[PDB]
């Protein structure tokens, strides 16, 4: 009965573990010890955007490296111009609970979805000079946790009922569904070539999916708590994961095993978001201890800290070209750091 | 030094900000409450009595507006579903005191909400429902407390309370026993930041709004006294 299947699965897992152990040859730190240190890094704030009346939960730069989108719980969605700290559009919301936002690569659509189990799409380039809703996507049984754009007609969504879906805006119905997670998922990432994407769940696991075929390809498990944020390496062959155990981990797609870990004996607080720079030497990571941090990607040695906030940080981002970073927190004050 | 096409944008931004502040001013007037309960509990019954995605209700008493939120889900793990709520003034909690089988597990549930890391500055209001069923069960004598709880026999009825002891000493005995059980966990590690208000209610009661109003007033008064250093 199920005993034979369990025995076969155990044998396969043992064989896979043996193969992974045999594949390992040397540690990355020993190879990279010869690299010179980058040295101390100092950054200072240049502008301080303000105007919100509640806590902040999301942020996403555009493709022009000048406009950004901010979402709160007060029921308003704001579009900011970074150069002159001006405002362009303010949009009301039907539901007062919002946890995600997204900004289209073309620049003509904005997607938003919170706790109402419904996603909404807003259009900006219309006559009569006002913003109005275009389409509502429904059909989920759990709160939305992330949404991203592939094009102007395809959107990927990750819900709290252990599901990921690919939609069709014009048609209005799903065309694919991804299953295989035990617990709820709380992250999503997209590849530069838009053919692969990964996800993170609360059962301390990571899965690599495939849009063209529609089934999982690889699974990784090295954590012991929830996974809060994921990031995808610019080259397209590495991961970046953060958990609640105050550790940051980098996975290798080709070797199917870990390579390095980032952890300090002093910090015990949680991790909320991670991001990369353009070149890849730096690694920016938020924290629950009222500050941020920057790590060396090759030495696992701390480089610098970013302080000045009055509460926990909720999101951060790096612009496309690599000019400046942006951070948001629960004190209602978004900040831009150079 | 700046062209007119930038002055117009600045004027637009100022006019947007003014209306934003004016619209955001109105939000502070109302009050908010979250409702948490389990199955077999008459949540909808008291909701309908007070009335006359996420279900939301609103009611007005003495020129004061209250919003009440409840969420329908079967995850059984709270997670970020509670991480959002950090500003509500109270968390209404309702249980069932008729079914002797489940109380123990219900107790464990309470502990979680009493010890959640995010909810360290939130006061809990506790309701006990289905008094008549308990009265009939204790009158019939089919079920005994000693079968499920063996500290009942050694306990003695506290004196100098006597709210309405006309029915029987046994009903007050059970009532105060259950009240003490629920209050003990709350008082174990209160530290004075947040406290609990027990109550007794039935299916046909109609004075719940007044009690909610009084407890909300007490909570606001206690917050203000701590704010102005007097305590």
């Amino acid at each position, epitope marked *: 009965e199920l005993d034979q299947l369990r025995q076969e699965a155990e044998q396969l897992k043992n064989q896979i573990r043996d193969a992974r152990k045999a594949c390992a040859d040397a540690t990355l730190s020993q190879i990279t010890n010869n690299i010179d240190p980058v040295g101390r890094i100092q950054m200072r704030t240049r502008r301080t955007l303000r105007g919100h009346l509640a806590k902040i939960y999301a942020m996403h730069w555009g493709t022009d490296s000048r406009l950004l989108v901010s979402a709160s719980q007060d029921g308003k969605l704001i579009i900011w111009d970074s150069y002159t700290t001006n405002k362009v559009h303010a949009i009301p919301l039907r539901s007062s609970w919002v946890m995600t936002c997204a900004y289209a690569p073309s620049g003509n659509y904005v997607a938003c979805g919170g706790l109402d189990n419904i996603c909404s799409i807003y259009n900006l380039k219309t006559r009569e000079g006002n913003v109005r809703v275009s389409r509502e996507l429904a059909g989920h049984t759990g709160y939305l946790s992330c949404c991203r754009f592939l094009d102007d007609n395809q959107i990927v969504t990750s819900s709290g009922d252990t599901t990921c879906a690919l939609w069709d805006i014009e048609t209005g119905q799903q065309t694919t569904t991804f299953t295989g997670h035990t617990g709820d998922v709380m992250s999503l990432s997209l590849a530069p070539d838009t053919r692969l994407f990964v996800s993170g769940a609360c059962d301390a696991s990571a899965k690599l999916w495939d849009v063209r075929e529609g089934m999982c390809r690889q699974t990784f498990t090295g954590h012991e708590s929830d996974i809060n944020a994921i990031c995808f390496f610019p080259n397209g062959n590495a991961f970046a994961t953060g958990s609640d155990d105050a550790t940051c981990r980098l996975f290798d797609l080709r070797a199917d095993q870990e390579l390095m870990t980032y952890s300090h004996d002093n910090i015990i607080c949680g991790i909320t978001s991670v991001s990369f720079s353009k070149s890849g030497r730096l690694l920016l990571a938020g924290y629950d201890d009222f500050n941020c941090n920057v790590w060396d990607a090759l030495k696992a040695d701390r480089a610098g800290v970013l302080a000045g906030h009055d509460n926990r940080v909720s999101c951060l981002g790096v612009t496309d070209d690599g000019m400046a970073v942006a951070t948001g927190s629960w004190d209602s004050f978004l900040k831009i750091w150079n | 030094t700046v062209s007119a*096409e930038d002055k117009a944008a600045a004027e637009r931004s100022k006019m947007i900000d003014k209306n934003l502040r004016e619209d955001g001013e109105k939000a502070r007037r109302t009050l908010r409450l979250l409702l948490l309960g389990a199955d077999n509990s008459g949540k909808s019954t008291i909701v309908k009595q007070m009335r006359i995605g996420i279900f939301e209700t609103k009611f007005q008493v003495d020129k004061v507006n209250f919003h009440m939120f409840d969420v329908g889900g079967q995850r059984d793990e709270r997670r970020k579903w509670i991480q959002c709520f950090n500003d509500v003034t109270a968390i209404i909690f309702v249980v069932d005191s008729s079914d002797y089988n489940r109380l123990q597990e219900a107790l464990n549930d309470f502990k979680s909400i009493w010890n959640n890391r995010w909810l360290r500055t939130i006061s809990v209001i506790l309701f006990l429902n289905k008094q008549d069923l308990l009265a009939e069960k204790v009158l019939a004598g089919k079920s005994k407390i000693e079968d499920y709880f063996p500290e009942f026999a050694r306990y003695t009825t506290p004196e100098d309370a006597t709210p309405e002891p006309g029915e029987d000493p046994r009903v007050t005995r059970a009532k105060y026993f259950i009240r003490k059980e629920f209050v003990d966990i709350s008082t174990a590690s209160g530290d004075g930041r947040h406290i609990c208000y027990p109550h007794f209610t039935c299916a046909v009661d109609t004075e719940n709004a007044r009690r909610i109003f009084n407890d909300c007033k007490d909570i606001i008064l206690q917050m203000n006294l701590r704010e102005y250093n007097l305590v």
Partner: single-chain antibody
Amino acid sequence: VQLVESGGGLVQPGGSRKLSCSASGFAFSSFGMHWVRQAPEKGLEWVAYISSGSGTIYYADTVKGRFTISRDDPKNTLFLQMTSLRSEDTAMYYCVRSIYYYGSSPFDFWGQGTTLTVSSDIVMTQATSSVPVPGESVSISCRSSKSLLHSNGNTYLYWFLQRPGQSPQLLIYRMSNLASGVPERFSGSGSGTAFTLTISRLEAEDVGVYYCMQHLEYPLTFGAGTKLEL
């Protein structure tokens, strides 16, 4: 989107009248408003400008003191009081709309206008008075008295077309951006104080008068214009 204007009558000098305009089909409280007039046998000329919220009002230097513009939001109406009639104020009147933010396209829609028959500043030049003229490419160049460029990096210049017996339109804004709902054959480029517009694969329904306009500073001034005769 619809704009309709009313008024206009022959009055001896010394009188005063009102000209009204109403909008239907779009939000009115957001946009600003302008007024333009054209002589029977001359080019266009600027008159007055009112912003949104009535924060600022700009008048032409030649007609200050005897004109008063105003608007009503609940009724969606823009109307002008004009007094002290002279013999040089007999012309046709047009009204337009515009909105200013990062990436907008001002001077978008032109409504109808009404006729009236009574009883330093930057100057820009156009060379050719007219050109007689399928399938060829035509280049029209006009020059400014001052360089049209600012520290931000944007050059302010607009191109307008007028067909016979029709209201003007918008073709090119900010010297390099194509407007909506037009064929892709048109193009424009140039450098400081020398701006050219090139049209390729010429066809029918392209005959009219072309104007190059500046918007760097008030007052706004048009050009002489050039025609194309088949």
